Amino acid sequence: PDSAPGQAAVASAYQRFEPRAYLRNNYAPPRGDLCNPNGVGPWKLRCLAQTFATGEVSGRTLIDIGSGPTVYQLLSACSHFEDITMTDFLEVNRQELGRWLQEEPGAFNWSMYSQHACLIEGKGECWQDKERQLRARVKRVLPIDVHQPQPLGAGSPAPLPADALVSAFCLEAVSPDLASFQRALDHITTLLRPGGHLLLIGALEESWYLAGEARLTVVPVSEEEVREALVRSGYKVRDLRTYIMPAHLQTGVDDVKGVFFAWAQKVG
Amino acid sequence: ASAYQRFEPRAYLRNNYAPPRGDLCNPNGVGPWKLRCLAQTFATGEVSGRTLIDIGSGPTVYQLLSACSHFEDITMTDFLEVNRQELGRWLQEEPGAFNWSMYSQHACLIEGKGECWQDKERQLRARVKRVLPIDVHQPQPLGAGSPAPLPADALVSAFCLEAVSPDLASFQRALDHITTLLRPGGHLLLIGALEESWYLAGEARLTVVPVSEEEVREALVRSGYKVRDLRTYIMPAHLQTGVDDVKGVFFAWAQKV
Numbered sequence: 001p002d003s004a005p006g007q008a009a010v011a012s013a014y015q016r017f018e019p020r021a022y023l024r025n026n027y028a029p030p031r032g033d034l035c036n037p038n039g040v041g042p043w044k045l046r047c048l049a050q051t052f053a054t055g056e057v058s059g060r061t062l063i064d065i066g067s068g069p070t071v072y073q074l075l076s077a078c079s080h081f082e083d084i085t086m087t088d089f090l091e092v093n094r095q096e097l098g099r100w101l102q103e104e105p106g107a108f109n110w111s112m113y114s115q116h117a118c119l120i121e122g123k124g125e126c127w128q129d130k131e132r133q134l135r136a137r138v139k140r141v142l143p144i145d146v147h148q149p150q151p152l153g154a155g156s157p158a159p160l161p162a163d164a165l166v167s168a169f170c171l172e173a174v175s176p177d178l179a180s181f182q183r184a185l186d187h188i189t190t191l192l193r194p195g196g197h198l199l200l201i202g203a204l205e206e207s208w209y210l211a212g213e214a215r216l217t218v219v220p221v222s223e224e225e226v227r228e229a230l231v232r233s234g235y236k237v238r239d240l241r242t243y244i245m246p247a248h249l250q251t252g253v254d255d256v257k258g259v260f261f262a263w264a265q266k267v268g
Numbered sequence: 269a270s271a272y273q274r275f276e277p278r279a280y281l282r283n284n285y286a287p288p289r290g291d292l293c294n295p296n297g298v299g300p301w302k303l304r305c306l307a308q309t310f311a312t313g314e315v316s317g318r319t320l321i322d323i324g325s326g327p328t329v330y331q332l333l334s335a336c337s338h339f340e341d342i343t344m345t346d347f348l349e350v351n352r353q354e355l356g357r358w359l360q361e362e363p364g365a366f367n368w369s370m371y372s373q374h375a376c377l378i379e380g381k382g383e384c385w386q387d388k389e390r391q392l393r394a395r396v397k398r399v400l401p402i403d404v405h406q407p408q409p410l411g412a413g414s415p416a417p418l419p420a421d422a423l424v425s426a427f428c429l430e431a432v433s434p435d436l437a438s439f440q441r442a443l444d445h446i447t448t449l450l451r452p453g454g455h456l457l458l459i460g461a462l463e464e465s466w467y468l469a470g471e472a473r474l475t476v477v478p479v480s481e482e483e484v485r486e487a488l489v490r491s492g493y494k495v496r497d498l499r500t501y502i503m504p505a506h507l508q509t510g511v512d513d514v515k516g517v518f519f520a521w522a523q524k525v
């Protein structure tokens with residue numbers, strides 16, 4: 001009933017979120033080992049690539065929900081949208097992205113992800129070009145809070161409503177419980193036009209993960225709880241797949257048991 | 269022949285394998301075309317065996333990227349010690365080795381097998397058993413007591429013969445010399461400059477014999493090869509850069525018969 005408390009714990013916890021530690025924990029090897037086809041990184045990129053390869057997900061505007069300090073989730077997307085908004089709750093994540101946008105050396109190096117996306121897209125694109133295009137297409141980086149009824153605030157810059165949403169490992173990671181998760185899904189759904197698509201990636205049955213000193217709390221969800229929430233929010237589920245976390249990728253940075261990928265289309 | 273003594277490996281690599289010629293992002297460039305020829309050829313599944321020799325390797329490895337997954341024993345060769353050492357440096361992942369990663373990436377890209385570039389380089393480094401001295405002007409280019417397993421199931425050679433031959437007949441002899449290294453039925457992939465007369469390698473100014481596509485064809489036939497394929501890349505203006513005067517690049521797939 002009372003949402004403020006939980007949301008408050010969440011905002012408090014994320015004050016210690018350390019972008020570099022999170023980058024190290026989830027995007028450096030072994031999880032970041034793009035050479036193993038059976039690994040989670042490759043599975044994620046594959047889900048994204050194949051979905052965009054249908055030609056079915058297009059438009060002018062895309063919004064990435066809770067980008068954090070990562071851009072891989074946009075590698076396959078960025079050829080299908082002119083205008084891309086990135087977003088995060090934390091300024092420090094926003095600056096990280098700033099560093100990559102400016103093509104700075106101190107920036108996290110995504111080039112293995114870029115190359116791998118080029119490889120699986122099968123268009124013989126070099127990664128430098130992929131990166132140049134993503135950089136061109138990211139039109140803004142915005143503060144966001146998915147617990148607000150207007151997640152971007154009122155009279156935001158973002159071209160609304162968007163043609164498509166992307167969101168990876170955000171909702172479940174900032175929702176104390178399932179009902180909060182559902183509301184979070186409801187709030188971002190206001191930003192999507194009817195007939196628009198949502199690509200949702202996330203952890204299955206996770207209760208915690210580490211990002212430096214910060215040990216943050218996650219609502220454990222199942223594939224079925226994810227399908228229901230999507231239906232509940234007004235989506236047709238077009239695709240929902242499950243990756244089971246291999247013991248060797250279960251590194252102690254979290255208690256994640258699997259990863260889900262959902263392609264959902266909002267009812268018009 | 270004495271000219272090759274001033275040949276600077278890094279200058280040669282700069283002149284030919286760094287941008288603009290080495291910008292792999294442009295599909296119409298010489299780099300991608302070369303890599304395309306190599307990959308398409310091996311993808312046929314018709315060039316295979318246990319052992320392969322790369323003739324006149326210089327300080328470059330890109331010419332074995334697509335090849336290395338069809339041959340378990342690979343021999344690399346060159347006339348200069350400095351080149352052999354430059355190879356050593358990349359094979360052993362020693363410091364200051366040349367960075368071939370862009371090319372590895374692009375072969376993986378072109379090959380379309382979903383292979384990561386690190387796996388590709390790993391396999392290459394593993395299958396290159398030895399780096400050997402060679403002089404194609406010699407009837408036995410490898411010498412007498414070579415560790416190289418003979419005869420080779422296949423040969424590769426890029427930009428060597430024309431660049432070490434004062435004239436057509438020398439070129440022809442050189443081809444004959446390397447052909448004795450190839451098993452009958454075996455395959456040869458020959459890449460090189462068309463209508464080139466000189467190129468620079470730092471302090472070295474090397475003389476080149478200018479050959480035509482049809483001259484290259486006849487040479488292969490005269491050496492007893494059947495020409496399965498011969499393609500020309502015409503040199504765009506923006507890749508004509510003062511380091512030489514080549515007009516085009518040829519690619520030849522020949523079979524000893």
Ligand SMILES: Nc1ncnc2c1ncn2[C@@H]1O[C@H](CSCC[C@H](N)C(=O)O)[C@@H](O)[C@H]1O
Binds near residue numbers: 070088
């Ligand atoms: N109340 C809130 N509303 C929207 N995003 C939030 C939020 N609280 C935290 N976040 C952001 O949610 C992210 C979870 S980590 C996911 C990072 C990135 N999307 C990737 O795929 O790895 C963090 O970047 C965090 O700052």
Ligand SMILES: Nc1ncnc2c1ncn2[C@@H]1O[C@H](CSCC[C@H](N)C(=O)O)[C@@H](O)[C@H]1O
Binds near residue numbers: 323327347402
């Ligand atoms: N007499 C000779 N016999 C065999 N190779 C020779 C030679 N004289 C010079 N070479 C080698 O021929 C090479 C020409 S350039 C290097 C070509 C390299 N394979 C690549 O594809 O770019 C030089 O490395 C040179 O050292």
Ligand SMILES: Oc1ccnc2ccccc12
Binds near residue numbers: 254
């Ligand atoms: O790819 C990921 C990003 C963030 N968290 C993750 C947790 C488990 C497995 C993969 C993850």
Ligand SMILES: Oc1ccnc2ccccc12
Binds near residue numbers: 427512514
């Ligand atoms: O790829 C090359 C290697 C050596 N010489 C070259 C001359 C012109 C164009 C390409 C070349």
